[PDB]
Enzyme design. Structure first.
Site, PDB file in Angstrom:
ATOM      1  N   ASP A   1      22.237  51.448  -7.460  1.00 22.99           N
ATOM      2  CA  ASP A   1      21.159  52.122  -8.172  1.00 22.99           C
ATOM      3  C   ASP A   1      21.709  52.626  -9.499  1.00 22.99           C
ATOM      4  O   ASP A   1      22.779  53.251  -9.526  1.00 22.99           O
ATOM      5  CB  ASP A   1      20.632  53.272  -7.321  1.00 22.99           C
ATOM      6  CG  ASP A   1      19.779  52.777  -6.161  1.00 22.99           C
ATOM      7  OD1 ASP A   1      18.769  52.080  -6.412  1.00 22.99           O
ATOM      8  OD2 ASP A   1      20.144  53.043  -4.995  1.00 22.99           O
TER       9      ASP A   1
ATOM     10  N   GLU B   1      16.566  61.937  -8.291  1.00 25.17           N
ATOM     11  CA  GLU B   1      17.258  60.665  -8.180  1.00 25.17           C
ATOM     12  C   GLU B   1      18.616  60.723  -8.857  1.00 25.17           C
ATOM     13  O   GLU B   1      19.606  60.245  -8.298  1.00 25.17           O
ATOM     14  CB  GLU B   1      16.408  59.546  -8.801  1.00 25.17           C
ATOM     15  CG  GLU B   1      15.157  59.145  -7.993  1.00 25.17           C
ATOM     16  CD  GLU B   1      15.435  58.463  -6.652  1.00 25.17           C
ATOM     17  OE1 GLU B   1      14.465  57.953  -6.048  1.00 25.17           O
ATOM     18  OE2 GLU B   1      16.600  58.419  -6.189  1.00 25.17           O
TER      19      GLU B   1
ATOM     20  N   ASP C   1      23.519  48.027   1.463  1.00 28.38           N
ATOM     21  CA  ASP C   1      23.344  46.575   1.420  1.00 28.38           C
ATOM     22  C   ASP C   1      24.119  45.940   0.281  1.00 28.38           C
ATOM     23  O   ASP C   1      24.012  44.726   0.081  1.00 28.38           O
ATOM     24  CB  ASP C   1      21.879  46.149   1.253  1.00 28.38           C
ATOM     25  CG  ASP C   1      21.342  46.407  -0.158  1.00 28.38           C
ATOM     26  OD1 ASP C   1      21.016  45.408  -0.852  1.00 28.38           O
ATOM     27  OD2 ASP C   1      21.286  47.576  -0.588  1.00 28.38           O
TER      28      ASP C   1
ATOM     29  N   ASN D   1      24.461  51.301  -2.565  1.00 25.62           N
ATOM     30  CA  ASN D   1      23.661  51.238  -1.357  1.00 25.62           C
ATOM     31  C   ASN D   1      24.468  50.517  -0.291  1.00 25.62           C
ATOM     32  O   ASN D   1      25.408  49.774  -0.589  1.00 25.62           O
ATOM     33  CB  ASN D   1      22.333  50.536  -1.608  1.00 25.62           C
ATOM     34  CG  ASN D   1      21.531  51.222  -2.679  1.00 25.62           C
ATOM     35  OD1 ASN D   1      21.011  50.576  -3.587  1.00 25.62           O
ATOM     36  ND2 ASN D   1      21.461  52.548  -2.607  1.00 25.62           N
TER      37      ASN D   1
ATOM     38  N   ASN E   1      17.231  49.966  -8.828  1.00 26.22           N
ATOM     39  CA  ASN E   1      18.110  49.234  -7.922  1.00 26.22           C
ATOM     40  C   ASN E   1      18.419  47.832  -8.425  1.00 26.22           C
ATOM     41  O   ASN E   1      17.536  47.111  -8.899  1.00 26.22           O
ATOM     42  CB  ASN E   1      17.422  49.137  -6.557  1.00 26.22           C
ATOM     43  CG  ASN E   1      18.343  48.666  -5.468  1.00 26.22           C
ATOM     44  OD1 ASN E   1      18.195  47.560  -4.963  1.00 26.22           O
ATOM     45  ND2 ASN E   1      19.288  49.510  -5.081  1.00 26.22           N
TER      46      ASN E   1
ATOM     47  N   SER F   1      23.738  46.642  -2.900  1.00 25.17           N
ATOM     48  CA  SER F   1      23.125  46.779  -4.203  1.00 25.17           C
ATOM     49  C   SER F   1      23.580  48.101  -4.805  1.00 25.17           C
ATOM     50  O   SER F   1      24.238  48.915  -4.156  1.00 25.17           O
ATOM     51  CB  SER F   1      21.608  46.722  -4.082  1.00 25.17           C
ATOM     52  OG  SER F   1      21.140  47.790  -3.279  1.00 25.17           O
TER      53      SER F   1
HETATM   54  C1  LIG Z   1      13.372  52.436  -8.108  1.00 26.62           C
HETATM   55  C2  LIG Z   1      13.876  51.355  -7.200  1.00 26.62           C
HETATM   56  O1  LIG Z   1      14.633  50.482  -7.595  1.00 26.62           O
HETATM   57  N1  LIG Z   1      13.457  51.406  -5.945  1.00 26.62           N
HETATM   58  C3  LIG Z   1      13.875  50.421  -4.954  1.00 26.62           C
HETATM   59  C4  LIG Z   1      12.676  49.692  -4.348  1.00 26.62           C
HETATM   60  O2  LIG Z   1      12.049  48.894  -5.343  1.00 26.62           O
HETATM   61  C5  LIG Z   1      13.091  48.813  -3.172  1.00 26.62           C
HETATM   62  O3  LIG Z   1      11.950  48.493  -2.380  1.00 26.62           O
HETATM   63  C6  LIG Z   1      11.432  47.201  -2.505  1.00 26.62           C
HETATM   64  O4  LIG Z   1      10.792  47.012  -3.759  1.00 26.62           O
HETATM   65  C7  LIG Z   1      10.217  45.706  -3.913  1.00 26.62           C
HETATM   66  C8  LIG Z   1       9.669  45.635  -5.318  1.00 26.62           C
HETATM   67  O5  LIG Z   1       8.720  46.673  -5.530  1.00 26.62           O
HETATM   68  C9  LIG Z   1       9.145  45.507  -2.846  1.00 26.62           C
HETATM   69  O6  LIG Z   1       8.646  44.179  -3.026  1.00 26.62           O
HETATM   70  C10 LIG Z   1       7.278  44.078  -3.305  1.00 26.62           C
HETATM   71  O7  LIG Z   1       6.527  44.331  -2.130  1.00 26.62           O
HETATM   72  C11 LIG Z   1       5.122  44.456  -2.382  1.00 26.62           C
HETATM   73  C12 LIG Z   1       4.485  44.797  -1.054  1.00 26.62           C
HETATM   74  O8  LIG Z   1       5.114  45.925  -0.458  1.00 26.62           O
HETATM   75  C13 LIG Z   1       4.527  43.208  -3.043  1.00 26.62           C
HETATM   76  O9  LIG Z   1       3.338  43.594  -3.731  1.00 26.62           O
HETATM   77  C14 LIG Z   1       5.466  42.508  -4.035  1.00 26.62           C
HETATM   78  O10 LIG Z   1       5.165  41.119  -4.126  1.00 26.62           O
HETATM   79  C15 LIG Z   1       6.968  42.674  -3.783  1.00 26.62           C
HETATM   80  N2  LIG Z   1       7.744  42.372  -4.984  1.00 26.62           N
HETATM   81  C16 LIG Z   1       8.760  41.516  -4.990  1.00 26.62           C
HETATM   82  C17 LIG Z   1       9.476  41.365  -6.298  1.00 26.62           C
HETATM   83  O11 LIG Z   1       9.108  40.900  -3.988  1.00 26.62           O
HETATM   84  C18 LIG Z   1       9.755  45.648  -1.459  1.00 26.62           C
HETATM   85  O12 LIG Z   1       8.768  45.556  -0.438  1.00 26.62           O
HETATM   86  C19 LIG Z   1      10.508  46.972  -1.321  1.00 26.62           C
HETATM   87  N3  LIG Z   1      11.286  47.003  -0.089  1.00 26.62           N
HETATM   88  C20 LIG Z   1      11.270  48.039   0.736  1.00 26.62           C
HETATM   89  C21 LIG Z   1      12.149  47.928   1.946  1.00 26.62           C
HETATM   90  O13 LIG Z   1      10.588  49.035   0.517  1.00 26.62           O
HETATM   91  C22 LIG Z   1      14.121  49.429  -2.224  1.00 26.62           C
HETATM   92  C23 LIG Z   1      14.776  48.409  -1.323  1.00 26.62           C
HETATM   93  O14 LIG Z   1      15.449  47.428  -2.102  1.00 26.62           O
HETATM   94  O15 LIG Z   1      15.173  50.049  -2.979  1.00 26.62           O
HETATM   95  C24 LIG Z   1      14.714  51.069  -3.847  1.00 26.62           C
HETATM   96  O16 LIG Z   1      15.817  51.771  -4.332  1.00 26.62           O
END
Ligand SMILES: CC(=O)N[C@@H]1[C@@H](O)[C@H](O[C@@H]2O[C@H](CO)[C@@H](O[C@@H]3O[C@H](CO)[C@@H](O)[C@H](O)[C@H]3NC(C)=O)[C@H](O)[C@H]2NC(C)=O)[C@@H](CO)O[C@H]1O
Ligand code: NA
Length: 129
Positions: A52, A35, A48, A46, A59, A50
């Site tokens: 990292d 990473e 979008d 990113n 992120n 955002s």
């Molecule tokens: C290390 C890092 O920052 N990685 C980033 C990812 O976190 C991110 O993916 C999104 O992360 C969120 C939080 O984990 C996911 O939301 C969660 O979704 C699960 C179900 O999948 C649910 O249990 C939770 O309620 C929910 N949490 C919140 C706070 O809403 C979300 O689904 C992920 N999105 C995707 C597209 O995978 C990605 C994208 O922002 O970026 C990484 O860099």
């Protein structure tokens, strides 16, 4: 700060990441390697809008506030600059929160694509642990 491999392993273990949520220490060292290349000051924009931040490329859309990510949540309740410190405590606390949110270490795209299912134990070979 650019950490050495074993230096980061010892810091990650001291901050309680070894087997946190069942992910062995090698998973965390591997994830940090791909990473950020062990660089605590690593930042990457990113598409979008955002960003990292830090050794584990946390992120800004979801975990930290950088004041320039429209629509962002700040679930680790911390400035993103605090994820760039030479002391990785904040990055580890936030990673503990991230990996517990539901998709485990799949939250780290580099981990999913480059560490998941691999011999992650190789990453802690030779470290006094
Ligand atoms: C290390 C890092 O920052 N990685 C980033 C990812 O976190 C991110 O993916 C999104 O992360 C969120 C939080 O984990 C996911 O939301 C969660 O979704 C699960 C179900 O999948 C649910 O249990 C939770 O309620 C929910 N949490 C919140 C706070 O809403 C979300 O689904 C992920 N999105 C995707 C597209 O995978 C990605 C994208 O922002 O970026 C990484 O860099
Ligand atoms: Na933000």
């Amino acid at each position: 700060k650019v950490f050495g491999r074993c230096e980061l392993a010892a810091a990650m273990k001291r901050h309680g990441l070894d087997n946190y949520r069942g992910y062995s220490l090698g998973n965390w060292v591997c994830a940090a390697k791909f990473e950020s290349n062990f660089n605590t000051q690593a930042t990457n924009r990113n598409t979008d809008g955002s960003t990292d931040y830090g050794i584990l490329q946390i992120n800004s859309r979801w975990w930290c506030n950088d004041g320039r990510t429209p629509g962002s949540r700040n679930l680790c309740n911390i400035p993103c600059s605090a994820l760039l410190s030479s002391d990785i405590t904040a990055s580890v606390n936030c990673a503990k929160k991230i990996v517990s949110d539901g998709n485990g270490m799949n939250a780290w795209v580099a981990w999913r694509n480059r560490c998941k299912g691999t011999d992650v134990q190789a990453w802690i070979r030779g470290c006094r642990l």
